[PDB]
């Protein structure tokens, strides 16, 4: 899982070689190309780094804070330079300028999976098999190589591109940034996290499981759809919704339309007891993942056709 093929090794080396040419990121060295979309507490733009000519994704987080606080956030974000993986979005740098922190990243031309889902309606099982592999490996990388968990897996934090790559972003690195921003949705949080009890990487596995169900059925799955709505397919307030997650049984895929391997996979992800819930090691050898890994699915081609990359 941690071991890479030669295509992934070549691309990661190519990213770093280009990154070494960039140097120190400055506010005036960026030109706006387009707005990509309003995300977690800030607007993300597609931008050109004028000196290097590199296209980037730039998230601007508007905050009014003193030089002490903001300079601590920039040094905390420097660990993202070390997070080098085919399943983690590339980091160029971070800086402060005129009342707003900037985070500059690798541009992913396919966007996030909430955008792809909204375009697709629902995502096919075999496509979600490749999504599952990438999230597991991305989470395995952060945990093994950095002793880090994500803390915020959701469709908007899974980015994709026309080269067929699927990557994670917005994992917890800066404690001070979360303090100063305090925001994001808690609707993908695990029941034990919403109860404020012993939570770990198992909490991200729930979030993946729930995200996969949403992408599979084409709708955030809590509360469950009706028997009539499932036939048509194939309002709770946020506080009422978070109480439902803690108190009611977990969501499941509908039977018949998905394979029992995929149903079992998401079920093992959504067991409410984190001890009983499957771990990354167990999920990596799961029947769904083994089958998915063997399947030669053209994700890039599927993506481009679905979102209209001409
Ligand atoms: C650390 O915090 C982040 C998180 C994500 C990105 C990020 C977003 C992108 C992107 C690349 C990226 F690195 N590429 C294409 C694209 N299209 C739409 N979006 C966003 C629209 C709002 N919803 C979330 C995705 C993005 C950045 Cl820069 C910083
Ligand atoms: Ca300026
Ligand atoms: Ca200036
Ligand atoms: Mg977040």
Coordinates of C-alpha atoms and ligand atoms in Angstrom, one line a residue:
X1 CA 0.0 0.0 0.0
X2 CA 2.8 2.4 0.9
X3 CA 4.9 1.1 -2.1
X4 CA 4.5 3.0 -5.4
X5 CA 4.7 2.0 -9.1
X6 CA 7.1 3.8 -11.5
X7 CA 4.4 6.0 -13.0
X8 CA 3.5 7.4 -9.5
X9 CA 7.2 7.7 -8.6
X10 CA 7.9 9.7 -11.8
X11 CA 5.0 12.1 -11.3
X12 CA 5.9 12.8 -7.7
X13 CA 9.5 13.4 -8.7
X14 CA 8.2 15.7 -11.5
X15 CA 6.1 17.7 -9.0
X16 CA 9.0 18.2 -6.6
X17 CA 11.4 19.3 -9.5
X18 CA 8.9 21.9 -10.6
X19 CA 8.3 23.0 -6.9
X20 CA 12.1 23.5 -6.3
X21 CA 12.1 26.2 -9.1
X22 CA 9.3 28.3 -7.4
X23 CA 11.0 29.7 -4.3
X24 CA 9.3 31.9 -1.7
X25 CA 5.6 32.6 -2.5
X26 CA 4.5 36.3 -2.5
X27 CA 1.1 38.0 -2.9
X28 CA 1.9 40.1 -6.0
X29 CA 3.4 37.1 -7.9
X30 CA -0.2 35.6 -8.5
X31 CA -2.7 36.4 -11.2
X32 CA -6.4 35.3 -10.9
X33 CA -7.6 32.9 -13.7
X34 CA -11.0 31.8 -12.2
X35 CA -13.0 31.1 -9.1
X36 CA -13.1 27.4 -8.3
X37 CA -15.6 27.5 -5.5
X38 CA -16.3 28.6 -1.9
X39 CA -15.0 25.8 0.5
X40 CA -14.2 25.5 4.2
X41 CA -14.2 29.1 5.4
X42 CA -12.6 30.6 2.3
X43 CA -12.7 31.1 -1.5
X44 CA -10.4 28.9 -3.7
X45 CA -9.2 30.5 -6.9
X46 CA -7.4 29.0 -9.9
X47 CA -4.3 31.2 -10.2
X48 CA -1.1 31.6 -12.3
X49 CA 2.2 31.9 -10.4
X50 CA 3.5 34.6 -12.8
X51 CA 7.3 34.2 -12.3
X52 CA 7.4 30.3 -12.6
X53 CA 4.4 30.1 -15.0
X54 CA 2.9 27.3 -12.8
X55 CA -0.9 27.1 -12.4
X56 CA -1.9 26.6 -8.8
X57 CA -5.0 26.4 -6.5
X58 CA -5.0 29.2 -4.0
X59 CA -7.3 29.2 -0.9
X60 CA -7.7 32.6 0.9
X61 CA -8.7 32.5 4.6
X62 CA -9.8 36.0 5.7
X63 CA -8.7 36.5 9.3
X64 CA -7.9 39.6 11.4
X65 CA -5.0 38.4 13.6
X66 CA -1.7 39.8 15.0
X67 CA 1.9 39.0 13.6
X68 CA 2.4 36.5 16.5
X69 CA -0.6 34.3 15.6
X70 CA -0.3 34.4 11.8
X71 CA 3.5 33.6 11.7
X72 CA 2.8 30.6 14.0
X73 CA 0.2 29.3 11.5
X74 CA 2.7 29.6 8.6
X75 CA 5.3 27.5 10.4
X76 CA 2.7 24.9 11.4
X77 CA 1.7 24.6 7.7
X78 CA 5.4 23.8 6.7
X79 CA 4.8 20.1 7.5
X80 CA 2.8 19.9 4.3
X81 CA 6.1 20.2 2.4
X82 CA 6.9 16.7 3.8
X83 CA 3.6 15.1 2.9
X84 CA 4.7 13.6 -0.4
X85 CA 2.3 11.0 -1.7
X86 CA 0.2 10.1 -4.9
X87 CA -2.9 10.2 -2.7
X88 CA -2.3 13.6 -1.1
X89 CA -2.7 16.9 -2.9
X90 CA 0.6 18.7 -3.5
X91 CA 1.6 21.7 -1.4
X92 CA 3.5 24.7 -2.8
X93 CA 3.5 27.0 0.2
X94 CA 1.6 29.3 2.6
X95 CA 1.8 33.0 3.5
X96 CA -0.1 36.0 5.0
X97 CA -1.0 39.2 3.2
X98 CA -3.4 42.0 4.0
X99 CA -5.9 40.4 6.4
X100 CA -5.9 36.9 4.8
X101 CA -3.9 33.6 5.0
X102 CA -3.1 32.0 1.7
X103 CA -2.6 28.3 1.1
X104 CA -1.2 27.4 -2.3
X105 CA -1.7 23.8 -3.6
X106 CA -1.6 21.6 -6.6
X107 CA -4.5 22.4 -9.0
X108 CA -6.8 19.4 -9.5
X109 CA -8.7 20.0 -12.8
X110 CA -11.5 17.5 -12.0
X111 CA -12.5 19.5 -8.8
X112 CA -13.8 17.8 -5.6
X113 CA -16.2 14.8 -5.5
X114 CA -19.1 16.8 -4.1
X115 CA -18.9 18.7 -7.4
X116 CA -18.5 15.5 -9.5
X117 CA -21.4 13.9 -7.7
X118 CA -23.7 16.9 -8.3
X119 CA -22.8 16.6 -12.0
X120 CA -23.0 12.8 -12.2
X121 CA -26.2 12.4 -10.0
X122 CA -24.6 9.2 -8.6
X123 CA -21.2 7.6 -9.0
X124 CA -20.8 3.9 -10.2
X125 CA -19.7 1.2 -7.8
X126 CA -16.5 0.4 -9.8
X127 CA -15.5 4.1 -9.8
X128 CA -16.2 4.2 -6.0
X129 CA -13.8 1.2 -5.7
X130 CA -11.0 3.3 -7.0
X131 CA -12.1 6.2 -4.8
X132 CA -12.0 3.8 -1.8
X133 CA -8.4 2.5 -2.6
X134 CA -7.1 6.1 -2.8
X135 CA -8.7 7.3 0.5
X136 CA -7.4 4.2 2.4
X137 CA -3.9 4.7 1.0
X138 CA -4.0 8.4 1.6
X139 CA -5.1 7.8 5.2
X140 CA -2.5 5.0 5.6
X141 CA 0.3 7.4 4.4
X142 CA -0.7 10.2 6.8
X143 CA -0.8 7.7 9.7
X144 CA 2.3 5.7 9.0
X145 CA 4.7 8.4 7.6
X146 CA 3.6 11.3 9.8
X147 CA 1.5 10.0 12.7
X148 CA -1.4 12.1 11.5
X149 CA -5.1 11.4 11.0
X150 CA -7.3 13.4 8.5
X151 CA -10.1 14.6 10.9
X152 CA -12.3 15.8 8.1
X153 CA -12.9 13.2 5.3
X154 CA -15.9 14.3 3.1
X155 CA -16.6 14.4 -0.7
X156 CA -15.5 18.1 -0.8
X157 CA -12.1 17.1 0.6
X158 CA -11.5 14.3 -2.0
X159 CA -10.1 16.0 -5.2
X160 CA -9.7 14.3 -8.6
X161 CA -8.1 15.0 -12.0
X162 CA -8.0 14.1 -15.7
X163 CA -4.8 12.0 -15.2
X164 CA -7.0 9.6 -13.2
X165 CA -5.5 10.6 -9.8
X166 CA -7.6 10.8 -6.6
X167 CA -6.2 12.7 -3.6
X168 CA -7.0 13.9 -0.1
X169 CA -6.7 17.5 1.2
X170 CA -7.6 19.7 4.2
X171 CA -6.1 17.2 6.9
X172 CA -5.4 18.6 10.3
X173 CA -1.9 20.2 10.6
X174 CA -2.3 23.7 12.1
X175 CA -3.9 23.8 15.6
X176 CA -3.8 27.6 15.7
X177 CA -5.6 27.9 12.3
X178 CA -8.6 26.0 13.6
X179 CA -8.6 28.2 16.7
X180 CA -8.5 31.4 14.7
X181 CA -11.1 30.3 12.1
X182 CA -13.5 29.1 14.9
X183 CA -17.2 26.6 10.8
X184 CA -17.2 23.5 8.7
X185 CA -19.9 20.8 8.5
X186 CA -20.0 18.1 11.3
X187 CA -22.5 15.9 9.4
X188 CA -19.7 13.5 8.4
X189 CA -18.3 13.1 11.9
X190 CA -18.4 9.7 13.6
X191 CA -20.8 9.0 16.4
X192 CA -18.0 8.7 19.0
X193 CA -16.6 12.1 17.9
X194 CA -20.1 13.6 18.3
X195 CA -20.2 12.0 21.8
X196 CA -16.8 13.5 22.6
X197 CA -15.3 10.1 23.5
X198 CA -12.2 8.0 22.4
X199 CA -11.7 8.9 18.7
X200 CA -8.8 7.9 16.4
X201 CA -8.2 7.0 12.6
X202 CA -11.3 4.8 13.0
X203 CA -13.3 8.1 13.0
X204 CA -12.0 8.9 9.4
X205 CA -13.1 5.4 8.3
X206 CA -16.7 6.2 9.3
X207 CA -16.5 9.5 7.3
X208 CA -15.2 7.6 4.2
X209 CA -18.0 5.0 4.6
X210 CA -20.7 7.7 4.8
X211 CA -19.2 9.7 1.9
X212 CA -19.2 6.5 -0.3
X213 CA -22.9 5.8 0.5
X214 CA -23.8 9.4 -0.4
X215 CA -21.8 9.2 -3.7
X216 CA -23.3 5.7 -4.4
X217 CA -27.0 6.7 -3.9
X218 CA -26.7 10.4 -5.0
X219 CA -27.9 11.9 -1.8
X220 CA -26.7 12.5 1.8
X221 CA -28.0 9.3 3.3
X222 CA -29.2 10.4 6.8
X223 CA -32.2 10.1 7.4
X224 CA -32.7 6.9 5.2
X225 CA -34.7 7.2 1.9
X226 CA -38.2 5.8 1.7
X227 CA -39.1 2.6 -0.3
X228 CA -40.8 4.9 -2.9
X229 CA -37.8 7.2 -3.0
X230 CA -35.4 4.2 -3.6
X231 CA -37.7 3.2 -6.5
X232 CA -37.5 6.8 -7.9
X233 CA -33.7 6.9 -7.3
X234 CA -33.1 3.4 -8.8
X235 CA -36.1 18.6 6.6
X236 CA -33.9 17.8 9.6
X237 CA -32.0 20.6 11.3
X238 CA -28.2 20.1 11.8
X239 CA -28.7 19.5 15.5
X240 CA -31.5 16.9 14.8
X241 CA -29.2 15.3 12.2
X242 CA -26.2 15.0 14.6
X243 CA -28.5 13.5 17.2
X244 CA -29.8 10.9 14.6
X245 CA -26.1 9.9 13.9
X246 CA -25.4 9.2 17.6
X247 CA -28.8 7.5 18.5
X248 CA -30.1 5.7 15.4
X249 CA -28.7 2.8 13.3
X250 CA -26.1 3.7 10.7
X251 CA -26.9 4.1 7.0
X252 CA -26.6 1.3 4.5
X253 CA -26.6 0.9 0.7
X254 CA -29.9 -0.5 -0.8
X255 CA -29.8 -4.2 -1.7
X256 CA -30.0 -5.6 -5.2
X257 CA -28.4 -2.6 -7.1
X258 CA -25.0 -2.9 -5.4
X259 CA -22.7 -6.0 -4.9
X260 CA -22.7 -7.7 -1.5
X261 CA -18.9 -7.0 -1.4
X262 CA -19.5 -3.2 -1.6
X263 CA -22.4 -3.4 0.9
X264 CA -20.2 -5.3 3.3
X265 CA -17.3 -2.8 2.9
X266 CA -19.4 0.3 3.7
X267 CA -21.1 -1.7 6.5
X268 CA -17.7 -2.5 8.1
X269 CA -16.9 1.3 7.8
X270 CA -20.1 2.4 9.5
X271 CA -20.2 0.1 12.5
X272 CA -21.0 2.6 15.3
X273 CA -18.6 1.0 17.8
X274 CA -15.1 2.2 16.8
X275 CA -13.5 -1.0 18.3
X276 CA -15.8 -3.3 16.2
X277 CA -15.4 -1.0 13.2
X278 CA -12.8 -2.1 10.6
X279 CA -9.4 -0.5 10.5
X280 CA -7.1 0.5 7.5
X281 CA -5.2 -2.8 7.6
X282 CA -8.4 -4.8 7.5
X283 CA -10.0 -2.6 4.8
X284 CA -6.9 -2.9 2.6
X285 CA -7.4 -6.7 2.3
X286 CA -11.3 -6.5 2.1
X287 CA -12.9 -8.4 -0.8
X288 CA -14.3 -5.1 -2.4
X289 CA -10.8 -3.5 -2.4
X290 CA -9.0 -6.7 -3.7
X291 CA -11.6 -6.9 -6.5
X292 CA -11.4 -3.2 -7.2
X293 CA -7.6 -3.2 -7.3
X294 CA -7.6 -6.0 -9.8
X295 CA -10.3 -4.2 -12.0
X296 CA -8.6 -2.1 -14.6
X297 CA -11.2 0.8 -14.5
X298 CA -10.5 3.9 -16.6
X299 CA -11.3 6.6 -14.0
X300 CA -9.8 9.4 -16.0
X301 CA -12.0 8.7 -19.0
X302 CA -15.1 8.3 -16.9
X303 CA -14.5 11.6 -15.1
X304 CA -13.9 13.6 -18.3
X305 CA -17.1 12.3 -19.9
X306 CA -19.1 12.9 -16.7
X307 CA -18.0 16.5 -16.0
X308 CA -17.5 17.5 -19.7
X309 CA -13.7 18.0 -19.9
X310 CA -13.7 18.4 -23.7
Ligands
LIG1 C1 -6.1 23.4 2.7 O1 -7.3 23.9 2.1 C2 -7.5 23.6 0.8 C3 -8.4 22.6 0.4 C4 -8.6 22.4 -1.0 C5 -7.9 23.1 -1.9 C6 -8.1 22.9 -3.4 C7 -9.3 23.0 -3.9 C8 -9.6 22.8 -5.3 C9 -8.4 22.4 -6.1 C10 -7.2 22.2 -5.5 C11 -7.0 22.5 -4.2 F1 -5.8 22.3 -3.7 N1 -8.5 22.2 -7.4 C12 -9.7 22.3 -8.1 C13 -10.9 22.7 -7.4 N2 -12.1 22.9 -7.8 C14 -12.9 23.2 -6.9 N3 -12.1 23.3 -5.7 C15 -12.7 23.6 -4.4 C16 -14.1 24.3 -4.4 C17 -14.6 24.5 -3.0 N4 -14.8 23.1 -2.4 C18 -13.5 22.4 -2.2 C19 -12.8 22.3 -3.6 C20 -10.8 22.9 -6.0 C21 -7.0 24.1 -1.5 CL1 -6.1 25.2 -2.5 C22 -6.8 24.4 -0.1
LIG2 CA1 -0.5 42.8 -2.9
LIG3 CA1 2.9 45.3 -3.5
LIG4 MG1 -12.1 21.3 7.2

